[PDB]
Structure formats: C-alpha cells, structure tokens
Amino acid sequence: AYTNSFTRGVYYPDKVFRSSVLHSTQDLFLPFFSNVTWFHNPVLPFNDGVYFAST
Amino acid sequence: FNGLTGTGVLTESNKKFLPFQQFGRDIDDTTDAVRDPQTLEILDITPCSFGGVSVITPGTNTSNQVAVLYQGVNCTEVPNVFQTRAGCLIGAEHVNNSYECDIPIGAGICASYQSIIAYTMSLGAENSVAYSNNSIAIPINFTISVTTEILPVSMTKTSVDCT
Amino acid sequence: PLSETKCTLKSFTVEKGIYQTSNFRVQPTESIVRFPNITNLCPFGEVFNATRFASVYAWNRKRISNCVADYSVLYNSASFSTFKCYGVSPTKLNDLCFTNVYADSFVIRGDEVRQIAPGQTGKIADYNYKLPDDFTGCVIAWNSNNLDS
Amino acid sequence: MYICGDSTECSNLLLQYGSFCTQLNRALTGIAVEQDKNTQEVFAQVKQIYKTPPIKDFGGFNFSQILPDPSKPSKRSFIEDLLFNKVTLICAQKFNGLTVLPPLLTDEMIAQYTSALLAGTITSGWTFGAGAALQIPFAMQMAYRFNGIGVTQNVLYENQKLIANQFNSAIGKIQDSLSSTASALGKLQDVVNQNAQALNTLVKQLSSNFGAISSVLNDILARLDPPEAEVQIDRLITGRLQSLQTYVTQQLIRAAEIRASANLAATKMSECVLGQ
Amino acid sequence: LSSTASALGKLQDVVNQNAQALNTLVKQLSSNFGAISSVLNDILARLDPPEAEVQIDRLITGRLQSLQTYVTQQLIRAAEIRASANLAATKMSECVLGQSKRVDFCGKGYHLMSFPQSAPHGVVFLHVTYVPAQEKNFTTAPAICHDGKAHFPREGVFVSNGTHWFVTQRNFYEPQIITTHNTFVSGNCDVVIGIVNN
Amino acid sequence: LSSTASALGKLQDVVNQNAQALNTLVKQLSSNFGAISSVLNDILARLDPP
Ligand SMILES: *[C@@H]1O[C@H](CO)[C@@H](O[C@@H]2O[C@H](CO)[C@@H](O)[C@H](O)[C@H]2NC(C)=O)[C@H](O)[C@H]1NC(C)=O
Numbered sequence: 024a025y026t027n028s029f030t031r032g033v034y035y036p037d038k039v040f041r042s043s044v045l046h047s048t049q050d051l052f053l054p055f056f057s058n059v060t061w062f063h064n065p066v067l068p069f070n071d072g073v074y075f076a077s078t
Numbered sequence: 079f080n081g082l083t084g085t086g087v088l089t090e091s092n093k094k095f096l097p098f099q100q101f102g103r104d105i106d107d108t109t110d111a112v113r114d115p116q117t118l119e120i121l122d123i124t125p126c127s128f129g130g131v132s133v134i135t136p137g138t139n140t141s142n143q144v145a146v147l148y149q150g151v152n153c154t155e156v157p158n159v160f161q162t163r164a165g166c167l168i169g170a171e172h173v174n175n176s177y178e179c180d181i182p183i184g185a186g187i188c189a190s191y192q193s194i195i196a197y198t199m200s201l202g203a204e205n206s207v208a209y210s211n212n213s214i215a216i217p218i219n220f221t222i223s224v225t226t227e228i229l230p231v232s233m234t235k236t237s238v239d240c241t
Numbered sequence: 242p243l244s245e246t247k248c249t250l251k252s253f254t255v256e257k258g259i260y261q262t263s264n265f266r267v268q269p270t271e272s273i274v275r276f277p278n279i280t281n282l283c284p285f286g287e288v289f290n291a292t293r294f295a296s297v298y299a300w301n302r303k304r305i306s307n308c309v310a311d312y313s314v315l316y317n318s319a320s321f322s323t324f325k326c327y328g329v330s331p332t333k334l335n336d337l338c339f340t341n342v343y344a345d346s347f348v349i350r351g352d353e354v355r356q357i358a359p360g361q362t363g364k365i366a367d368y369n370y371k372l373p374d375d376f377t378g379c380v381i382a383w384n385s386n387n388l389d390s
Numbered sequence: 391m392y393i394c395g396d397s398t399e400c401s402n403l404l405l406q407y408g409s410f411c412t413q414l415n416r417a418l419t420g421i422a423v424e425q426d427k428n429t430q431e432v433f434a435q436v437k438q439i440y441k442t443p444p445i446k447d448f449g450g451f452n453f454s455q456i457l458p459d460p461s462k463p464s465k466r467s468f469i470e471d472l473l474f475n476k477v478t479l480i481c482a483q484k485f486n487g488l489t490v491l492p493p494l495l496t497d498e499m500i501a502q503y504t505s506a507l508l509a510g511t512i513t514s515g516w517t518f519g520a521g522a523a524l525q526i527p528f529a530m531q532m533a534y535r536f537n538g539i540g541v542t543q544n545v546l547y548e549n550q551k552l553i554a555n556q557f558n559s560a561i562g563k564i565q566d567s568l569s570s571t572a573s574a575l576g577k578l579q580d581v582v583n584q585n586a587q588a589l590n591t592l593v594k595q596l597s598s599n600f601g602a603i604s605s606v607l608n609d610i611l612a613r614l615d616p617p618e619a620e621v622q623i624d625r626l627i628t629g630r631l632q633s634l635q636t637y638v639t640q641q642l643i644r645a646a647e648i649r650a651s652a653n654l655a656a657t658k659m660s661e662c663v664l665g666q
Numbered sequence: 667l668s669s670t671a672s673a674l675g676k677l678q679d680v681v682n683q684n685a686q687a688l689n690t691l692v693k694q695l696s697s698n699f700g701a702i703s704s705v706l707n708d709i710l711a712r713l714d715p716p717e718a719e720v721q722i723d724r725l726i727t728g729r730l731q732s733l734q735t736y737v738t739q740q741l742i743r744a745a746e747i748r749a750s751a752n753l754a755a756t757k758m759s760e761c762v763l764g765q766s767k768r769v770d771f772c773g774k775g776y777h778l779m780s781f782p783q784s785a786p787h788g789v790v791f792l793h794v795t796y797v798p799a800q801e802k803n804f805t806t807a808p809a810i811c812h813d814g815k816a817h818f819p820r821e822g823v824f825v826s827n828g829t830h831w832f833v834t835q836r837n838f839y840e841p842q843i844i845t846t847h848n849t850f851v852s853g854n855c856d857v858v859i860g861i862v863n864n
Numbered sequence: 865l866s867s868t869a870s871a872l873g874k875l876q877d878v879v880n881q882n883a884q885a886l887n888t889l890v891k892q893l894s895s896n897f898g899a900i901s902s903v904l905n906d907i908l909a910r911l912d913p914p
Pocket residue numbers: 152153154161479
C-alpha cells in the first residue's frame with residue numbers, strides 16, 4: 024500500500040536561532056514527493072535513518 | 079562564555095528563544111544573542127562605537143588652528159561640541175547664517191574660516207522674476223567676454239622591465 | 242592634530258582642506274568570564290594510575306565527559322616523557338573549554354612509537370591504527386620495564 | 391580592521407607586507423570624492439534660484455502636476471513622489487569596518503535646483519542660460535519654438551486650444567504608465583543590485599578556511615603557540631588581500647562607466663533643457 | 667592669468683598622481699615580504715641553493731603582485747586620459763574650425779570664435795562670447811490686424827513704448843516702423859488672442 | 865577598396881588581440897609553477913597526500 028508522503032520530514036538541523044533569513048543547508052533530509060511502505064512485527068532495515076511516522 | 083571569546087556591549091535582549099537553542103546569529107556569522115550557562119537568561123551583543131578621524135584646516139600659511147571631526151560615533155562618548163548628521167565636530171562655533179561656502183563636510187553642513195565656523199550652505203541669491211503676459215524684456219547693450227578652459231591630452235610615457 | 246596631518250601628508254605645508262589621519266577604538270575594560278556549575282573530579286586519574294593495558298588488535302576506548310580536567314598537574318609531572326601535542330598547545334589546555342574527550346590506552350614496541358603520528362605511513366601505522374589527517378588531541382608514551390617486561 | 395580584527399601581532403605580521411593598506415584607501419577616497427563632483431556637475435548649472443510666480447496664466451497649459459507643492463515633506467511634486475515611492479540615524483557599522491558616508495548634497499537642495507530650473511524654463515524661455523532672465527509670455531515662447539523647426543508661427547496662434555488639450559492629455563497619461571508599470575525604472579535598479587551583491591560576497595567570503603585550521607583569528611590565537619602559530623596566521627592574510635584587491639578593481643571599473651553616464655546626462659541637461 | 671596661480675589644477679593633479687604612483691611602486695621594493703632580507707644578493711651570499719630558494723620565491727611573488735597592481739592602475743588612468751583626449755579633440759574640431767550653435771558647449775553665452783594655445787601636457791582654449799545687458803521691458807502684442815486682416819511679423823516681435831507700435835529683433839533694440847515688407851497676412855482677427863487695433 | 869590591402873585595420877586588430885589573449889591564456893596550463901610536474905594526473909599518483 025504505497026503512499027505519497029508529500030512534504031513531511033523537515034527538522035531543525037542545528038541549535039542556532041535565526042530570523043527572516045533564507046538558509047541553504049545540506050544534510051540527510053527526506054526527499055519531497057516520496058513513496059512510503061505502509062505496514063501492519065517485521066524486522067526492517069536501517070540504512071542511515073528512519074522516518075517513523077505513525078497514527 | 080564557555081570558550082566563546084568576544085568583544086562588545088551587552089544588553090537585555092528582547093528576542094525569544096525556543097527551549098532548545100543556545101545562541102542566535104544573523105547574516106553570515108555574527109553572534110548577537112547568547113544564553114548564560116548559570117543563571118539562564120538571554121543577552122544580546124552589539125558593537126561599541128568606532129570610526130575614523132578627520133581634520134579640517136584653513137591652511138598653515140593663513141592660520142595655525144584646526145577643527146576635529148569624528149565620523150561614526152556621535153558626541154556622547156568622546157573623552158564647542160556640535161552634533162551633525164554625519165559624526166560630530168569639536169572646535170567650530172555654529173552660526174545661524176548661510177553663505178556660499180568653502181570646504182564641505184556632509185549632509186549639507188560645511189565649515190570655513192571667517193575663526194572656523196560651521197553652517198549650512200546657501201544655494202544662491204534668490205530673486206523672483208516678475209512674470210506677466212503683457213510685457214517683454216529686451217536688452218539694449220552688449221558686451222564681449224573671454225573665457226578660458228584647460229584640457230589634458232597625454233601624460234608621461236614610462237616603461238618597466240622585469241628582470 | 243596638525244602634527245598628525247603633517248605626518249600623513251609628509252610635508253611642512255598643508256593647503257586648506259579636510260584630511261583623514263587615522264581611526265580610533267573604544268578600549269574595553271572589566272573582562273568577564275562565565276562557566277557552568279559542573280563540580281566533580283574526573284576519573285582520568287584512575288585511568289592513568291591503573292595500568293592493565295591491551296595491545297593493538299584490541300585497543301580500549303573510553304569516554305570522558307562532565308569533568309573538571311586538570312592538565313597542568315600532569316604536564317609538570319616528569320613520569321611521562323613525550324608530549325609533542327599537535328593541534329591545541331600542551332600548555333594552553335586549561336583556558337579552552339572542550340566538548341568531549343576520548344581516551345585510548347595500549348602498549349606498543351619501542352620501534353613504532355614514532356609511527357603514531359598523522360600524515361605518515363609505516364608497518365603498524367598504516368595497517369593497524371591510523372590517525373586521521375586532522376588533529377586528534379595528542380599522544381603520551383612512557384617506558385614500562387617492570388610490569389609487562 | 392577588516393584583515394586583522396582587533397589583534398596586535400596580526401598587525402605585526404601585516405607590517406611585513408609593505409604598505410598594502412593605504413593605496414586601497416586612497417583609491418576609495420578618490421572614488422568617494424569623485425562621486426560628489428558627478429552630482430555637482432549636473433544640477434548646479436543655474437547661478438540664482440528662481441521661484442514660480444503666483445500667476446498661473448500660461449495660455450491654457452496646466453503645469454500643476456510637476457510644480458512643487460507646499461504641502462509636502464520636502465516640497466516635492468507628484469511625479470517626483472511617484473518616482474521616489476517606486477524605488478526600494480547614525481548606527482551603520484559592523485565588525486568588518488564597512489562604512490557608508492552620506493552625500494554632501496541633500497535631497498531638499500536637489501529639489502530646489504530642479505524647481506529653479508523648471509521655473510526659469512517656464513518664465514524666461516531660453517535666455518536664462520546665456521545672460522540674465524528676461525520674462526516673456528509662454529505663448530510667444532511656444533510660437534518661437536515652432537518657428538525654430540520650420541513651421542510658421544501662425545499655426546500655433548490659431549490652434550492653441552487643441553495643442554493645450556493634447557499636452558494636458560499627454561501629461562495626464564504618464565501618471566498611469568508610471569504607477570502601473572513597476573518595471574519602468576530598469577536602469578536605476580541594476581547598479582544598486584550589483585553593489586549589494588558585490589558587498590554581500592565580500593562580507594561572506596570572510597568565513598573561509600583558506601587552507602588554515604579555522605576561519606576565525608581569536609580561536610586560533612588562543613590555542614596555538616605563537617612560535618608555531620606564525621604559519622597558521624599566514625595563509626589567511628594572503629587571501630583576504632586578494633579579495634580586497636579584486637573588490638577595489640571591480641569598484642573602479644564599474645565606477646568609470648557611471649562617470650561616463652553622468653557626463654552624458656550633464657551634456658543632455660545643458661543642451662536640451664537650457665536651449666533647443 | 668599672470669598673478670593668480672593654482673588655476674591649472676587638472677595638469678598638476680595628473681602629474682602628482684603619476685609621480686605618487688611611481689614613487690609608491692619604487693618604494694614597495696624595500697620590504698621583507700616574509701623573507702629574511704630585502705635584497706637577494708645578501709640571501710644568496712649567506713645561504714646555499716638547497717634552501718635559499720624559498721625566500722627567493724616569496725620575494726618574487728610579492729614583487730609580481732605589486733607590479734600587477736601598478737600595471738592595472740596605469741591601464742585605468744590611460745583609459746581616462748584617452749577619454750579626455752577624445753573630448754578635447756572633438757571640441758577643437760568643432761569650435762575652432764567653425765561656429766557652434768549648441769548652447770553652453772564653448773563658452774557661456776552666444777559663441778563667436780576661439781583660439782587654442784599649448785600647455786605642458788594639455789591645451790588651453792580662449793573662447794570669445796557675446797552677452798547682453800542693460801535690459802528694458804515694454805508692452806508686447808502677438809499679432810496686429812488691419813482692415814480685418816491679421817498681420818504677423820516676418821522676423822522679430824511687436825513692441826510699444828506707450829503710444830506707438832514698432833517691430834524689433836529679439837536680441838537687440840532697433841525700432842522700425844511697421845510696413846508690409848516685414849509683415850505677412852494670415853486669416854482674420856477673430857480667433858487670435860491678443861489682437862490690438864492699429 | 866578591392867585593391868588596397870590592410871584597410872580594415874581596426875577590426876583585424878581587435879580580432880588578433882582577442883585571439884592572442886585566448887592563446888596566451890591557454891598556454892599558461894603547462895607552466896610548472898614550482899611543483900614537481902606540470903600535469904596533475906601523475907602528481908596525484910606519484911606522491912603521498914601530505
Ligand atoms: C547620540 O547617541 C546617543 C546614544 O544612544 C543617542 O541617545 C539615544 O538615542 C536613541 C535613538 O538613537 C533615542 O531613542 C534615545 O532617546 C536617546 N537617548 C537619549 C538620552 O538621548 C542619541 O539620540 C544620539 N543623537 C544625539 C543627537 O544625541
């Protein structure tokens with residue numbers, strides 16, 4: 024049951040405060056318009072980080 | 079601050095921090111707001127005043143006294159004071175007259191000898207032409223004038239070797 | 242100021258005009274220093290006192306954090322021989338405040354003590370334990386001729 | 391200040407590089423002083439300062455849209471206000487030594503110069519450029535200007551109302567064009583953007599390793615031995631010198647064309663406004 | 667010109683700029699640039715080819731940067747001098763060899779003629795200009811209609827000293843009686859504003 | 865025009881100047897610049913990183 028995760032997975036990368044500035048960064052972000060494997064207790068791979076959205 | 083060495087003047091910051099930041103910044107890398115490691119508050123950092131120094135002189139041949147202008151800082155911490163829109167100058171007496179003036183300073187204020195007075199320049203003599211729709215003015219006499227101007231065309235020819 | 246103008250123009254006669262001499266700065270005073278409230282002796286003393294080491298094939302790794310580290314007392318000690326600390330200064334270890342400390346302890350033969358240095362090859366250096374191309378603390382070695390000998 | 395931030399031995403090392411701190415300042419001072427003559431040459435061409443008479447009998451022409459208005463902050467007219475609104479006290483200083491100097495000529499005196507020129511053109515024809523102002527009715531000035539291009543002077547005196555209406559409509563039509571079209575001033579915005587981006591690049595280039603250990607001097611100074619820190623303090627000055635030199639060269643190159651444009655504008659003002 | 671000096675500011679400024687640039691360039695040759703000494707003969711004499719090359723390299727790179735900066739500044743100044751020379755050539759070609767009708771190109775007023783003169787590194791012009799004065803203002807009128815025909819002036823303008831009407835040229839006051847030789851008829855005097863009986 | 869040569873002096877001079885500038889920019893690639901070799905492929909594979 025594939026699902027399009029539209030624009031989820033944006034987090035603050037650093038512990039610094041900014042305001043009204045367009046900041047360009049580079050890190051492990053979830054790509055936009057990706058497809059997520061819906062599940063329903065199986066062992067799953069952990070490549071470099073897992074976005075564990077849940078209801 | 080915990081290894082962060084910095085110079086500036088501190089103030090009670092008014093910005094707000096989320097409970098997980100430690101220090102803010104601005105365009106490029108300008109640390110302004112810091113959170114103290116013991117008493118848990120926020121203080122913002124701003125530069126203390128600094129600038130260049132200018133000297134206004136009417137010529138050694140004429141007189142032997144000058145005026146000092148500070149560009150940047152205004153005359154509140156500079157240990158005949160006068161405040162302008164570009165720094166502040168000390169040593170000149172401010173007058174309330176307007177003359178077509180000598181050495182310019184800035185923002186329309188210019189100082190000149192008279193004992194080194196600073197004022198606001200005057201654009202020129204003001205006259206109002208009596209315009210009318212039933213009268214014209216015709217000259218009766220004429221004069222011949224001679225005007226000069228100088229234009230450079232070339233400079234010295236120089237050659238420089240390497241070895 | 243007239244003397245400064247004559248200096249900057251390098252002449253004894255100055256014409257009517259406005260000139261620039263230099264710039265000034267406000268001298269800061271009453272320096273202040275802040276630090277956290279951590280107060281506990283660090284177990285690096287028992288790390289150095291106790292000598293039950295391993296060898297290259299299994300090198301111990303220890304985490305040092307939440308300490309008040311005192312390197313001056315170890316620096317003045319003559320028990321150790323080679324400090325040769327890269328990166329940070331051996332004597333300036335007490336005025337900079339660190340984030341985390343890593344400790345490694347082992348035993349090596351005397352012909353490879355020089356091989357433990359960044360940016361070089363060898364036999365036990367390039368094949369067993371490489372220091373990365375950047376500064377990583379520093380290395381201390383001492384002679385032990387009564388315990389493992 | 392820019393190269394060695396509030397440090398002492400940094401200045402000691404910089405003193406060994408000759409005198410690469412004065413010629414840049416001299417060039418910048420020359421640019422700054424020339425940017426004042428550029429503005430002085432154009433506007434300052436009328437000896438006196440005339441003002442428009444209260445009489446508004448110009449034969450039908452309506453000049454109230456461009457004459458100065460007393461109920462304004464700086465006695466500016468409508469078109470000047472529209473132009474000003476379409477273009478986007480002393481605290482300016484940073485930890486880098488970036489300084490902005492205010493112009494000698496304030497906007498109020500510029501507006502006064504423009505008003506004087508407009509009043510002279512309206513109420514004295516073209517005779518206020520050669521000698522002294524000679525008042526003359528506007529209709530005869532228009533008739534002479536028609537006569538100067540070949541058309542006889544009896545055309546104007548019999549078609550005055552039509553020309554007045556056409557001029558009024560043309561004047562009214564320009565306000566809508568100025569207000570609606572936001573991309574009309576495509577020549578006064580490029581230079582500002584170029585200057586801003588160049589300064590932003592210059593200030594942003596500071597935070598670069600340049601092959602050293604860190605991009606900040608104080609952290610390096612508090613960690614390394616001065617006997618050994620000499621090499622690491624180097625490799626940082628040599629890049630900042632190059633950056634400053636490149637910025638100065640680009641500033642000179644781009645200021646030359648601005649001066650050329652100022653000369654062209656001065657020629658246009660002298661030849662097309664004072665006379666025909 | 668004889669007594670009042672300092673009027674030749676442009677040539678003096680150019681010469682001073684060139685001299686200062688050359689002096690700074692020749693003065694830059696006496697810096698260590700990070701090496702041990704500012705002269706290569708000493709470094710060669712006190713050292714050996716094994717390691718004497720590093721200081722030489724430092725000196726060479728410093729001197730090369732200084733030379734490049736000087737060359738760039740000279741190029742910019744040469745371009746400016748070329749622009750000034752072009753302007754001077756245009757002025758000399760247009761005003762000296764003819765007459766100028768464009769206002770405020772040569773002189774301040776109505777241009778007549780000019781004389782060129784040499785200079786140490788430039789040229790000096792002597793424009794002769796015409797300027798009016800001693801103004802007097804009268805009561806004007808656009809056109810005058812006689813017998814229902816609106817006469818207009820051929821070249822000039824109508825004026826009146828108070829009782830009589832005359833036609834005079836623009837830039838001078840030479841009264842002439844009104845006749846049919848210098849007035850032309852066009853239409854009838856019912857649409858023109860300012861018609862005065864005469 | 866069709867008989868006398870070298871009449872198009874300015875255009876030819878401009879083209880020659882541009883070509884010479886490009887050529888002298890290209891030629892600078894082979895300079896040793898104080899390294900051990902001018903080309904980089906061998907210098908990367910011959911010496912250690914330090
Ligand atoms: C000169 O500098 C002082 C230092 O701050 C200025 O003092 C304050 O300036 C702010 C805004 O610049 C005002 O809101 C405050 O009311 C000022 N405080 C006082 C006590 O005056 C000062 O305004 C600056 N200018 C002058 C002319 O003094």
